[PDB]
Write a protein that holds these residues in place. Structure first.
Motif, PDB file in Angstrom:
ATOM      1  N   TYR A  50      -5.642   9.842 -15.071  1.00 27.13           N
ATOM      2  CA  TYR A  50      -5.874   8.465 -14.739  1.00 27.13           C
ATOM      3  C   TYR A  50      -6.983   8.391 -13.742  1.00 27.13           C
ATOM      4  CZ  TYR A  50      -1.689   6.667 -16.865  1.00 27.13           C
ATOM      5  OH  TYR A  50      -0.689   6.311 -17.797  1.00 27.13           O
ATOM      6  N   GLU A  53     -10.062   8.731 -15.256  1.00 23.67           N
ATOM      7  CA  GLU A  53     -10.462   7.601 -16.052  1.00 23.67           C
ATOM      8  C   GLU A  53     -10.706   8.214 -17.371  1.00 23.67           C
ATOM      9  OE1 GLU A  53     -13.799   6.644 -12.112  1.00 23.67           O
ATOM     10  OE2 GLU A  53     -13.753   8.479 -13.278  1.00 23.67           O
ATOM     11  N   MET A  55       5.721   1.434 -22.065  1.00 25.72           N
ATOM     12  CA  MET A  55       4.319   1.090 -22.056  1.00 25.72           C
ATOM     13  C   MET A  55       3.521   1.706 -20.933  1.00 25.72           C
ATOM     14  SD  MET A  55       4.678  -3.050 -21.272  1.00 25.72           S
ATOM     15  CE  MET A  55       5.823  -3.020 -22.683  1.00 25.72           C
ATOM     16  N   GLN A  56       3.814   2.971 -20.561  1.00 29.77           N
ATOM     17  CA  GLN A  56       3.012   3.707 -19.613  1.00 29.77           C
ATOM     18  C   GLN A  56       1.739   4.149 -20.279  1.00 29.77           C
ATOM     19  OE1 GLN A  56       5.940   2.644 -18.233  1.00 29.77           O
ATOM     20  NE2 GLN A  56       6.743   4.335 -19.523  1.00 29.77           N
ATOM     21  N   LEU A  67      -4.656   1.685 -19.644  1.00 28.93           N
ATOM     22  CA  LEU A  67      -5.314   1.078 -18.495  1.00 28.93           C
ATOM     23  C   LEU A  67      -6.787   0.844 -18.810  1.00 28.93           C
ATOM     24  CD1 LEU A  67      -6.086   4.007 -18.462  1.00 28.93           C
ATOM     25  CD2 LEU A  67      -4.881   4.280 -16.284  1.00 28.93           C
ATOM     26  N   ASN A  68      -7.613   1.851 -18.545  1.00 28.97           N
ATOM     27  CA  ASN A  68      -9.042   1.763 -18.818  1.00 28.97           C
ATOM     28  C   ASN A  68      -9.654   0.489 -18.245  1.00 28.97           C
ATOM     29  OD1 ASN A  68      -7.373   2.993 -21.135  1.00 28.97           O
ATOM     30  ND2 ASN A  68      -9.368   3.987 -21.405  1.00 28.97           N
ATOM     31  N   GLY A  69     -10.510   0.646 -17.241  1.00 32.67           N
ATOM     32  CA  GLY A  69     -11.179  -0.489 -16.633  1.00 32.67           C
ATOM     33  C   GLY A  69     -11.259  -0.391 -15.122  1.00 32.67           C
ATOM     34  N   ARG A  70     -10.073  -1.051 -14.788  1.00 30.73           N
ATOM     35  CA  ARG A  70      -9.983  -1.649 -13.499  1.00 30.73           C
ATOM     36  C   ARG A  70      -9.138  -0.799 -12.789  1.00 30.73           C
ATOM     37  NH1 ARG A  70      -8.235  -7.682 -12.075  1.00 30.73           N
ATOM     38  NH2 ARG A  70     -10.165  -8.999 -12.169  1.00 30.73           N
ATOM     39  N   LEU A  71      -7.790  -1.142 -12.823  1.00 33.08           N
ATOM     40  CA  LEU A  71      -6.867  -0.140 -12.371  1.00 33.08           C
ATOM     41  C   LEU A  71      -6.288   0.587 -13.544  1.00 33.08           C
ATOM     42  CD1 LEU A  71      -4.878  -1.970  -9.517  1.00 33.08           C
ATOM     43  CD2 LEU A  71      -6.973  -0.501  -9.392  1.00 33.08           C
ATOM     44  N   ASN A  72      -5.532   1.605 -13.276  1.00 30.15           N
ATOM     45  CA  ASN A  72      -4.923   2.492 -14.165  1.00 30.15           C
ATOM     46  C   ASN A  72      -3.445   2.042 -14.163  1.00 30.15           C
ATOM     47  OD1 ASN A  72      -7.697   3.594 -13.695  1.00 30.15           O
ATOM     48  ND2 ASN A  72      -6.749   5.265 -14.837  1.00 30.15           N
ATOM     49  N   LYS A  73      -2.713   2.191 -15.335  1.00 32.73           N
ATOM     50  CA  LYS A  73      -1.331   1.812 -15.429  1.00 32.73           C
ATOM     51  C   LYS A  73      -0.500   2.682 -14.537  1.00 32.73           C
ATOM     52  CE  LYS A  73       0.523  -0.782 -17.942  1.00 32.73           C
ATOM     53  NZ  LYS A  73      -0.945  -0.701 -18.097  1.00 32.73           N
ATOM     54  N   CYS A  74      -0.697   4.012 -14.609  1.00 36.32           N
ATOM     55  CA  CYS A  74       0.129   4.891 -13.832  1.00 36.32           C
ATOM     56  C   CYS A  74      -0.393   4.943 -12.436  1.00 36.32           C
ATOM     57  CB  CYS A  74       0.157   6.331 -14.369  1.00 36.32           C
ATOM     58  SG  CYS A  74       1.200   7.432 -13.364  1.00 36.32           S
ATOM     59  N   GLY A  75       0.124   4.048 -11.574  1.00 35.45           N
ATOM     60  CA  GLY A  75      -0.288   4.043 -10.203  1.00 35.45           C
ATOM     61  C   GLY A  75       0.176   5.316  -9.575  1.00 35.45           C
ATOM     62  N   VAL A  76       1.429   5.727  -9.861  1.00 33.99           N
ATOM     63  CA  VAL A  76       1.890   6.957  -9.284  1.00 33.99           C
ATOM     64  C   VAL A  76       2.938   7.550 -10.170  1.00 33.99           C
ATOM     65  CG1 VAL A  76       3.075   8.143  -7.479  1.00 33.99           C
ATOM     66  CG2 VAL A  76       1.472   6.181  -6.981  1.00 33.99           C
ATOM     67  N   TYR A  88       6.121   5.071 -11.869  1.00 36.30           N
ATOM     68  CA  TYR A  88       6.030   3.885 -11.102  1.00 36.30           C
ATOM     69  C   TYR A  88       5.472   2.578 -11.774  1.00 36.30           C
ATOM     70  CZ  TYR A  88       6.262   2.231  -6.142  1.00 36.30           C
ATOM     71  OH  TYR A  88       6.668   1.596  -4.995  1.00 36.30           O
TER      72      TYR A  88
END
Lengths: 130, 200, 263, 142, 195
Positions: A15, A18, A41-42, A65-74, A130
């Motif tokens: 992540y 990216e 939906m991770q 995710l791809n972009g901005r933030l990533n889905k898997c924050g942690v 998370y």
RNA sequence: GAGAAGUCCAUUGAACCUUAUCAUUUAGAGGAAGCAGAAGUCGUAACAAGGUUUCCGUAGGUGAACCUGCGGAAGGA
RNA sequence: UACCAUGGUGGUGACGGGUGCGGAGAAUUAGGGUUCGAUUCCGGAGAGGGAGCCUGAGAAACGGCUACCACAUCCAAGGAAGGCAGCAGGCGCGCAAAUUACCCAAUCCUGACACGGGGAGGUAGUGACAAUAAAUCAAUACCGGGCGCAUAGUGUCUGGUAAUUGUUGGAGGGCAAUCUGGUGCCAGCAGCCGCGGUAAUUCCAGCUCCAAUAGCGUAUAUUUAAGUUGUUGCAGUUAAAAAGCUCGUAGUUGGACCUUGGGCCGGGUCGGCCGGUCCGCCUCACGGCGAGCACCGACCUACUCGACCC
RNA sequence: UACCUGGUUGAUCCUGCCAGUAGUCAUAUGCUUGUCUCAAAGUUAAGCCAUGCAUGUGCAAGUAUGAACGUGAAACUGCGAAUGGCUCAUUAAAUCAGUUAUAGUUUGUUUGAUGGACUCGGAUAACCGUAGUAAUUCUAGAGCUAAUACGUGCA
């Protein structure tokens, strides 16, 4: 030992990277974790390429995710399987506040904490996505 | 024990050290007999019994499990149910069938395993019927949290060492099982003892 | 105080929401930073496929591209330039011109203080610190002070005299300020441990607190925050860790809410 | 961490180790000592003070009933103590001052300060001012 | 002892005038110090209410306050009670107010809502006005009294709980000098030196 | 027919003395100088490439701090 | 106890040593653990030390004996004579713990056939050793100061006077609280720091300030803090710390895929005494006590299903 | 709620400990206690003990009864004095806990079960009369007397 950590680390590292997606070798328990990741939906999806005769397998797991933030924050491991640090149906100590989920190979299979909780099962936590 | 339980019926005020007088006033019977006795024990299904212009009471359990008196009809007072607690087997067909109250019976009467119950009158010390511990019969539960409830036996599971659990159909609400020791049979198609409101 | 928490939906997830909204964007990931470069390249291929060039400029196109170079311009944000923060506070007023500029009548290092509005400013503490030179060893002072509006950002500054340091310090906290989203009546959005060096600085949502991070708690507009900050009773470091907490919040809803982009 | 928490035959090894390493103090305490101890002393002497600065406090050595002889500090201003007497000792810790492991707190024959106020139960006297000291002296004599 | 907290409370309320700043701890503490003071009740005691409040599940702040209608409090909203720790408070000890038709005379109990506070017939007709009247009358008399009197600590009128003190006329002077010579040698200390 | 005082063999099987030794509380034959107070003497080692760069294993040996032979190290030119 | 076999046990700690009753439980601390194990409830054990025996259903017996020893006692000094770690109370040890009191009214039990007995037990006396609530102030008029109005004077609170109405801890810092007098590294003080070397924020007295307030601190013990025994909750490159390194075990763990059982898991139903802890109700004026009711308890035992992973 | 702050320093940050601070005991120093009301009440000597006293019943357990006047009462026999109380010395142990085993075994008395009004004799304490080592403790030479305690005949 067990792979487990590698898969997890590979994902979060990815992540940050990216990276479009990641790949590695897999089982039923580490397909199983991956599936739970997809279910909640991770990740977009995962594939296990070359799965029939060759000496190994692999698993193309696509990150979401791809972009901005990533889905898997942690995502972190806690304690893998075979095992002990063990929880009960009820004992469920935890992170997030229900925002996240904790993959728990229960008795029943590998399911998420909520299901296991319902499922009326405890098991062994895999990690806290998370 | 007899004292505690008569004393239980009193608990307003002012006996205990005076206790001794109630018994002497020969106004108490257990199973239709005179006993005036301070160390006496009584237990479930005993019939206990007061004056003259008087009444009759049955020792039962409340929902928690302590033994307490309940008012009983004169009609019912005539009978008592005795659970067969143990057996020393034999003669001819006689087991020595121990019962819960501590009564002996040697011999026939047509049947008989532990947990079966015998319906007995009182005056003669005659056995009217046997209530089998089997599915389809009704039982009352003698102890625990589960205490003071009744049900019909759906099925019994037997294992090694002992017959482990008795399952009940019932409830006005739902299904529950207990070990056999807990189960006291009270009714069959032919003869019931059940006319007492209900229940989880 | 308590606990997960529950009720209701949208209402609840409001407040600082806007700073949340924008801000979700601007850190991570490919948009935002972190370094954003090749990730640009990877970006260029998609967008083309989507909006589409109409192929001699004409009408349509001229607009569209500048609608692309604006997510890119936005992407640059490293959260030390106002964007997300700005729109929330109010604003309009002559004063706004001056801040975006450029030195009109005012502004040299100033001009954000008026705008935010009333608020208590209390001195947290003052500390010594003695630094030894050729002729004689020169007493200084370093004062950490917080007025805070409704976000959180702690400030340490020094001057060789006690009084001047604080005055400039007061500006210094209010400018370059970051809004953590609270989520409840003065409750943290989700549990976060922020650490710099050897300080173990965890916060979770329970009761009151003590010491350095307690006075901090009040000023972010938290009222129940159970902060077990352990590895040093050295007060300058204790506040510093905690500031890094109270700006990069990163609760689930932050992760999910993203879809949108803005002018 | 090493193992962390597993099964097959394994918890026990670093239960053993932890007890063994143990800093603090084992098997409660007494290599001298504790508890309220009343040592009857006949040495009045003066001893010096710790590496940081000087002074010369007046001290009185006492030999304990529980067989030990050490130097004890006396608190409060002024003092007298006589035939023996029995002066009761708290055995509090400085974290250190030389040879001075204990101090004798006020207790029976151990007197308190010149008739005061200020205060009176640290540095201590009698009824209003004094009244107690006058009676105190009488006790040991008869 | 009670006079003194009320005086402090009053000081905190008013203003400008002399003073510097504070610290960390002092802020948390000082606030705690006001809210008990209205009630003019002890600190063992706010904290004991506070502890039952922490122990009941719900929103922490509110329950302590929200469950501050206590019989003492209540009378104050009803306005019959002049101040909480009032003459009316003393009246609560006198047994004048009722809760559930029954009497209690501790102020400390905690009132729940939809409870009826009325006076009682008997206690209207006070025992000890009669006696005061009695002198006048057909006898003697002599007045009054609040006091500020004493009796112990010790007449002047500014007195007792609390305090005045007085005990005036020291002279301590000598006694220190009497501990400066005395405490000196001998008794020290076996130093054999010679220059 | 019962069977007192009673005397003997065998067994479980007390307490003083016989061991011999270990343990505890103790004191203690005679003896070594580990730390310490400040108020001491001796030299000036280490401390700056400390005026012979430090430290280290190892033996020798020196009033001592220590020295040096050999080999090793850079926490060293 | 004969005879035959020579064994059985222990790197998963046997055998042995030391330890300022075991469980139910207590105290903590958000949880975890730590701690504590006791007077009470429960089980066991011993009655100055030790063995044996009669009696009796039951004793290997505190209120029985035998009898060696230990130690007091009686003596017409021949011979007897004792069991308080049972109540009250002595003695001395020690820091330190009660009347040479009263009663079976309650409570339970021994006795037996119906009222008798008890230092079991309850009382009251002593006693701030756990607990709590209330005082003493306090409410109110009137002169003097500040704040809400607007020289002044109004509305409101304080610093005193007039009417009626039911103590101890500290004040430099920790840590909350700047006089005056006297002393001058002398004397004393602070549990670290540090203060006194003459105009002391630290001694000491007195005023004043104040934290708490019929309690307080001080010491001992113990725990939290102290993630400083770290399981949750830490280090080992320069901080205590990586074994010189290997060959290898008992001991922690285990890459993929299919299938069978099922030791690790859900429901259970038993037990988990009472007391205590928590909720809430009343009862003695209140309260704490106490009563009555409710709710929670690990874990461990039956039964059946269930299999991903070890 | 719990959370910390002082001291290594010219000053700093980190490691790290001392110390304050918080709560608590079956405890002590204690100055100081107007109050209602309940409560702890020798981990020191399992050292040593004076003084009173901690177990009693015949209006259906038992035949008899000197002395006291059918009524009470001293001994014998039956039930009891082993329950209870209190102290943790011993004490790491199938000691204790929790679960089972127990036909591998006890339970008198009782609650309950099973069995079942001819004739009788025997000696004995109290009471007595004196006593020995004798002040003695203690019990006997000893008159007299009663046994659902004893011994029998037995469908």
């Amino acid at each position: 030992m067990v792979r487990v950590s590698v898969l997890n680390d590979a994902l979060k590292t990815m992540y940050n990277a990216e990276k479009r997606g990641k790949r590695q070798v897999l089982i039923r328990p580490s397909s199983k974790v991956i599936i739970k990741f997809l279910i909640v939906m991770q990740k977009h999806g995962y594939i296990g390429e070359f799965e029939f005769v060759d000496d190994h397998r692999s698993g193309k797991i696509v990150v979401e995710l791809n972009g901005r933030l990533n889905k898997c924050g942690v995502i972190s491991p806690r304690f893998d399987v075979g095992v002990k640090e063990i929880e009960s149906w009820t004992a469920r100590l935890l992170p997030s506040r229900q925002f996240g989920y904790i993959v728990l190979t229960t008795s029943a299979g590998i399911m998420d904490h909520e299901e296991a909780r319902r499922k009326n099962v405890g098991g062994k936590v895999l990690g806290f996505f998370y | 024990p007899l004292i505690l339980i008569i004393r239980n019926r009193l608990k307003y005020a002012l006996t205990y050290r005076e206790v001794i007088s109630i018994l002497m006033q020969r106004h108490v019977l257990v199973d239709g007999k005179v006993r005036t006795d301070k160390t006496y024990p009584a237990g479930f299904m005993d019939v206990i019994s007061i004056p003259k212009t008087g009444e009759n009471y049955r020792l039962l359990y409340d929902t928690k499990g302590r033994f307490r008196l309940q008012s009983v009809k004169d009609e019912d007072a005539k009978f008592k149910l005795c659970k067969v607690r143990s057996v020393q087997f034999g003669q001819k067909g006689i087991p020595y069938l121990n019962t819960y109250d501590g009564r002996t019976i040697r011999y026939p009467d047509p049947i008989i395993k532990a947990n079966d119950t015998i319906k007995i009158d009182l005056e003669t010390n005659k056995i009217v019927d046997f209530i089998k511990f089997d599915v389809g019969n009704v039982v009352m539960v003698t102890g625990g949290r589960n205490t003071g409830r009744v049900g019909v036996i759906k099925n019994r599971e037997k294992h090694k060492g002992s017959f482990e659990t008795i399952h009940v159909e019932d409830a006005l609400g739902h299904q529950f099982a207990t070990r056999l020791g807990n189960v006291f049979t009270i009714g069959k198609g032919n003869k019931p003892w059940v006319s007492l409101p209900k229940g989880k | 105080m308590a606990e997960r928490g529950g009720e209701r939906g949208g209402e609840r997830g409001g407040f600082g929401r806007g700073f949340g909204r924008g801000g979700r964007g601007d850190r991570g990931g490919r948009r935002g930073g972190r370094r954003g470069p090749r990730q640009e390249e990877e970006k260029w291929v998609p967008v083309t496929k989507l909006g589409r060039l109409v192929k001699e400029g004409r009408f349509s196109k001229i607009e569209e591209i500048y609608l692309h170079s604006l997510p890119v311009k936005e992407h640059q944000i490293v959260e030390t330039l106002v964007p997300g923060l700005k729109d929330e506070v109010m604003k309009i007023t002559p004063v706004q011109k001056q801040t975006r500029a450029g030195q009109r009548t005012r502004f040299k290092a100033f001009v954000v203080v008026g705008d935010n509005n009333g608020h208590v400013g209390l001195g947290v503490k003052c500390a010594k610190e003695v630094a030894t030179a050729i002729r004689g060893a020169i007493i200084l002072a370093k004062l950490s002070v917080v007025p805070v509006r409704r976000g959180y950002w702690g400030n340490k500054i020094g001057q060789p005299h006690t009084v001047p340091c604080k005055v400039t310090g007061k500006c210094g906290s209010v400018t370059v300020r970051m809004v953590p989203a609270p989520r409840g009546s003065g409750i943290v959005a989700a549990r976060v441990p922020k650490k710099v060096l050897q300080f173990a600085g965890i916060e979770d949502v329970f009761t009151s607190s003590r010491g350095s991070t307690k006075t901090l708690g009040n000023f972010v507009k938290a009222t129940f925050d159970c902060l077990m900050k352990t590895y040093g009773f050295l007060t300058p470091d204790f506040w510093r860790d905690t500031k890094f907490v109270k700006s990069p919040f990163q609760e689930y809803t932050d992760l999910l809410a993203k879809p949108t982009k803005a002018l | 961490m090493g193992k962390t928490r597993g099964m097959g035959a394994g918890r026990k090894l670093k239960t053993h180790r932890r007890n063994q390493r143990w800093a603090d103090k084992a098997y409660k305490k007494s290599h001298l000592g504790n508890e309220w101890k009343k040592p009857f002393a006949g040495s009045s002497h003066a001893k010096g003070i710790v590496l940081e600065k000087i002074g010369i406090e007046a001290k009185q050595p006492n030999s304990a009933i529980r067989k030990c002889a050490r130097v004890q500090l006396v608190k409060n201003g002024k003092k007298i103590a006589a035939f023996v007497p029995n002066d009761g000792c708290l055995n509090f810790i400085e974290e250190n001052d030389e040879v001075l492991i204990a101090g004798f707190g006020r207790k029976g024959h151990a007197v308190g300060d010149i008739p005061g106020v200020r205060f009176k139960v640290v540095k201590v006297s009698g009824v209003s001012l004094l009244a107690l000291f006058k009676e105190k002296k009488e006790k040991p004599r008869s | 002892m009670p006079r003194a907290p009320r005086t402090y409370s009053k000081t905190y309320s008013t203003k400008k005038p002399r003073r510097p700043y504070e610290k960390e701890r002092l802020d948390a503490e000082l606030k705690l110090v006001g809210e008990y003071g209205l009630r003019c009740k002890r600190e063992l005691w706010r904290v004991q209410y506070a502890l039952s409040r922490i122990r009941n599940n719900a929103r922490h702040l509110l329950t302590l306050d929200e469950k501050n209608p206590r019989r003492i409090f209540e009378g104050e909203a009803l306005l019959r009670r002049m101040n909480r720790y009032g003459l009316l408070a003393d009246g609560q000890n006198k047994l004048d107010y009722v809760l559930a038709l029954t009497v209690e005379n501790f102020l400390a109990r905690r009132l729940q809502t939809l409870v009826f506070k009325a006076g009682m017939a008997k206690s209207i007709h006070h025992a000890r006005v009669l006696i005061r009247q009695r002198h006048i009358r057909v006898g003697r008399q002599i007045v009054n009294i609040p006091s500020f009197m004493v009796r112990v600590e010790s007449e002047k009128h500014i007195d007792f709980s609390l305090t005045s003190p007085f005990g005036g006329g020291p002279p301590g002077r000598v006694k220190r000098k009497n501990q400066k010579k005395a405490s000196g040698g001998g008794g020290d200390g076996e130093e054999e030196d010679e220059e």
